[PDB]
Amino acid sequence: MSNKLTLDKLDVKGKRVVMRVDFNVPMKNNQITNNQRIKAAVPSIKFCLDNGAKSVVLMSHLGRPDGVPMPDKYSLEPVAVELKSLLGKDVLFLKDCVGPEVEKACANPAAGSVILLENLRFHVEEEGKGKDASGNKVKAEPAKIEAFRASLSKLGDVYVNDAFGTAHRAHSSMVGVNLPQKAGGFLMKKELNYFAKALESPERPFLAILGGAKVADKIQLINNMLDKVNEMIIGGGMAFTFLKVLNNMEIGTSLFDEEGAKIVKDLMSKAEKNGVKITLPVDFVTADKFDENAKTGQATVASGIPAGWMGLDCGPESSKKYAEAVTRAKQIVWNGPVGVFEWEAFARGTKALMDEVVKATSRGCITIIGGGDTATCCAKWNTEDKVSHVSTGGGASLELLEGKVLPGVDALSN
Ligand SMILES: Nc1ncnc2c1ncn2[C@H]1O[C@@H](COP(=O)(O)OP(=O)(O)O)[C@H](O)[C@@H]1O
Ligand code: ALF
Numbered sequence: 001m002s003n004k005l006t007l008d009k010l011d012v013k014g015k016r017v018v019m020r021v022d023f024n025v026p027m028k029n030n031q032i033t034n035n036q037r038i039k040a041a042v043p044s045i046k047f048c049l050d051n052g053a054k055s056v057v058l059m060s061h062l063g064r065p066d067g068v069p070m071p072d073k074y075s076l077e078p079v080a081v082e083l084k085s086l087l088g089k090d091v092l093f094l095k096d097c098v099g100p101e102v103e104k105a106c107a108n109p110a111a112g113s114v115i116l117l118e119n120l121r122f123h124v125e126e127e128g129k130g131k132d133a134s135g136n137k138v139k140a141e142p143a144k145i146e147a148f149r150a151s152l153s154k155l156g157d158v159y160v161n162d163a164f165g166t167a168h169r170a171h172s173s174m175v176g177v178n179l180p181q182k183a184g185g186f187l188m189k190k191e192l193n194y195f196a197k198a199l200e201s202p203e204r205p206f207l208a209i210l211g212g213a214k215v216a217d218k219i220q221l222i223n224n225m226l227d228k229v230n231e232m233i234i235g236g237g238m239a240f241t242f243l244k245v246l247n248n249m250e251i252g253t254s255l256f257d258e259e260g261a262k263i264v265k266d267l268m269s270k271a272e273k274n275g276v277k278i279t280l281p282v283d284f285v286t287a288d289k290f291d292e293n294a295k296t297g298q299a300t301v302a303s304g305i306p307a308g309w310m311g312l313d314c315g316p317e318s319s320k321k322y323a324e325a326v327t328r329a330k331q332i333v334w335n336g337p338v339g340v341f342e343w344e345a346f347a348r349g350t351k352a353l354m355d356e357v358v359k360a361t362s363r364g365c366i367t368i369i370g371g372g373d374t375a376t377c378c379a380k381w382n383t384e385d386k387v388s389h390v391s392t393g394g395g396a397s398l399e400l401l402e403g404k405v406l407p408g409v410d411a412l413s414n
């Protein structure tokens with residue numbers, strides 16, 4: 001922000017623009033379920049076209065293909081199709097993001113042309129670490145990583161970064177494009193401004209709700225969050241990693257993070273030290289396979305979860321507790337659903353939680369729900385204008401909350 005180059009200060013007339021966007025949208029059965037993330041990036045894309053930009057080249061990622069190409073699953077071609085509609089302009093989709101063939105198309109396009117490169121996470125050089133065919137985690141070669149970044153840089157004359165949602169990751173698209181002028185997009189600015197107002201001087205008590213399925217990544221955030229919040233609800237897939245360590249509970253086939261489990265005790269003790277109330281689930285709704293149409297089951301912390309069964313939602317007694325926390329708080333940040341909201345058997349808990357968050361905003365409490373899947377709850381239940389702010393980044397928003405500057409923003413020009 002503030003001392004870094006921005007799109008409004010940028011000159012794009014006659015120049016090709018390579019733009020990093022967060023088009024990592026929710027997919028069901030190969031089709032889009034929400035387009036906010038896409039819709040949010042349009043102002044920046046149009047700006048360039050209206051100001052006489054020769055082309056706009058769009059780079060983004062979908063899901064976690066672990067460095068291997070999966071066009072059948074994690075392809076960006078359907079995206080791509082929505083963009084035309086929001087765009088009102090013909091969009092051209094390429095089956096790779098590199099190089100000589102792709103560089104050919106991007107080398108000097110026809111005026112007003114926008115190009116969607118293929119998914120970046122098909123290459124190990126983005127992250128750059130990944131899984132091979134074995135499922136063996138591997139890392140990309142330093143030299144190759146660096147060739148990857150030189151490839152992107154032929155795609156445009158100026159670089160614009162609008163991907164607030166991935167701004168917290170130091171990947172090759174985010175920090176690697178070497179161009180003389182690297183400018184932050186409007187989404188980046190709109191979002192960064194909003195959070196400078198919200199954090200820096202939070203209304204208290206301040207509560208942080210944690211959920212979702214990305215356990216391994218999101219526990220590492222907690223520790224620095226403990227210094228900035230008053231209360232924490234930790235539900236969703238996170239919950240089981242905590243409960244097995246803390247109470248030697250039995251969690252069945254539920255998500256578990258082993259590395260995360262090594263820090264659970266310390267995290268509790270720092271919460272005590274700082275007096276942050278940690279709220280966890282006391283009962284769950286269970287399933288025998290990972291399916292919409294699985295057989296349902298009931299469980300408690302005391303009861304444990306039966307072998308080969310998994311907890312995909314939180315029980316009614318658990319929702320009762322969360323709701324006590326919500327009522328106390330005057331600012332709330334929520335990332336990650338507490339259950340699998342997409343499937344009707346497991347959307348009970350998440351629905352209840354949102355319902356409470358909406359009342360909270362009525363009494364003047366400030367509510368931020370951020371994240372690609374957690375945002376989709378709002379769209380599904382039409383609570384988008386009922387909450388104080390709905391944000392495009394979830395993990396990214398939490399990383400602002402810790403105090404570290406974002407890799408994406410630190411890499412912008414000064
Ligand atoms: N145990 C579980 N297993 C699978 N999905 C779960 C889950 N618990 C909750 N969910 C729900 O959490 C969602 C995880 O999405 P995430 O990317 O972490 O949230 P973000 O984009 O950061 O805001 C997933 O779609 C499912 O609806
Ligand atoms: F899927 Al996220 F924050 F991790 F939107």
Ligand SMILES: [Cl-]
Nearest residue numbers: 214215216217
């Ligand atoms: Cl993760």
